[PDB]
């Protein structure tokens, strides 16, 4: 366990291979052809020799946390309060090039600190620097919800129930494609031309709940049934 | 019209129609009547021939077991369908 890898040390090979190929009677292998001038590091020693655990001599496998304990204290407090801020760019994998709001805002926290703000107040504010930034980003989302929904090519949740409300009807009530062909036409009528003792009559067609493309042009006339209700100015 | 050729072949090769297999046809003949009525009327009489044979073959199965409830349940399906 003491010399467990000294026989497999890289130098001990290239050192020996040095005098091997040097004699000229041993065609040097491919690696020594290349590692002849790119020789490995000088001061990479096993822990088995440098009897110290903290001696992380290998330059690549180096494990260490440069994050100051104060910073691990700081960034943890900002993160723990607001998951969305912590997990901005790391929801599936850490992204190199984009900058993470936690970083950019934890940068603001230091500026508020030196500007006189006590810690407890800086954390309440610098977090709001996100919540007023996500505000617009989530606000604009509702703004471009109008342009899409009002254009009619985009489905909110209320219409999403219908699709599955239909999709469920298919397997729950098997419909032959012949019958499905009617559910296309018989619903398209209610969808296009629909509208919201002989007793006077029922709650029927004169007041229904279904929404139709017909009903839309009625809901453009303010229920007047006439083209001319808008009293405002107009081209003449 | 192609389907009612298939049902004839599979029975020509040897398979027997079962009750669920016949209601398959009835579902096609009832809903898809866009053909002229005579074409229905040869089926509307031939499709019956299955049931009448199907039921006759149905009871011989449940004959000895002295079960009338299932028997009355099996004919119940056959009764409404011809209605």
């Amino acid at each position: 366990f003491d010399t467990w890898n000294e026989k497999y040390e890289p130098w001990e090979h290239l050192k020996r291979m040095g005098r091997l190929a040097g004699t000229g009677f041993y065609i040097p292998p491919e690696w020594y052809n290349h590692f002849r001038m790119f020789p490995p590091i000088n001061h990479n020693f096993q822990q088995e020799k440098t009897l110290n655990p903290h001696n992380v001599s290998e330059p690549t496998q180096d494990d260490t946390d440069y994050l100051s304990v104060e910073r691990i204290a700081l960034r943890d407090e900002l993160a723990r309060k607001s998951r969305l801020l912590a997990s901005e760019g790391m929801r599936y994998y850490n992204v190199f090039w984009i900058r993470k709001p936690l970083d950019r805002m934890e940068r603001h926290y230091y500026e508020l600190e030196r500007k006189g703000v006590a810690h407890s107040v800086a954390i309440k504010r610098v977090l709001q620097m996100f919540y007023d930034e996500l505000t617009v980003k989530k606000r604009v989302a509702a703004i471009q919800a109008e342009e899409a929904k009002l254009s009619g090519k985009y489905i909110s949740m209320r219409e999403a129930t219908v699709l599955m409300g239909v999709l469920t009807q298919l397997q729950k009530e098997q419909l032959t494609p012949h019958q499905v062909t009617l559910l296309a036409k018989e619903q398209r009528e209610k969808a296009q031309a629909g509208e919201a003792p002989s007793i006077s009559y029922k709650v029927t067609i004169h007041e229904t709940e279904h929404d139709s493309v017909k009903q839309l042009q009625e809901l453009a006339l303010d229920h007047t049934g006439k083209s001319d209700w808008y009293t405002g100015a107009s081209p003449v | 019209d192609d389907v009612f050729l298939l049902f004839d072949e599979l029975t020509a090769l040897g398979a027997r129609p079962d009750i669920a297999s016949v209601e398959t046809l009835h579902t096609v003949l009832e809903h898809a009547a866009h053909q002229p009525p005579e074409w229905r009327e040869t089926r509307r009489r031939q499709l019956v021939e299955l049931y009448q044979y199907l039921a006759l073959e149905e009871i011989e199965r449940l004959a000895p077991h002295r079960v009338d409830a299932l028997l009355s349940a099996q004919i119940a399906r056959l009764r409404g369908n011809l209605k």
């Binding site: 366990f1 003491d2 467990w4 822990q47 088995e48 494990d63 997990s87 790391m90 929801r91 599936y92 994998y93 850490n94 | -």
Partner: protein, 54 residues
């Protein structure tokens, strides 16, 4: 030299870690990445870097 390379906790010969690399669970989930299968997964969000208790 009698013990060899050992760990102080329970003599383990490897550092304890459930997860080490920043994009391991991504790379193994590659097929499900391009195919949009993992757009809203939680197990790939929640435990991407879950490492054992101290």
């Amino acid at each position: 030299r009698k013990r060899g390379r050992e760990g102080w906790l329970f003599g383990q010969q490897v550092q304890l870690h459930y997860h080490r690399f920043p994009d391991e669970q991504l790379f193994t989930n590659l097929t499900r990445w391009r195919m949009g299968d993992t757009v809203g997964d939680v197990a790939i969000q929640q435990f991407r870097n879950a490492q054992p208790f101290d």
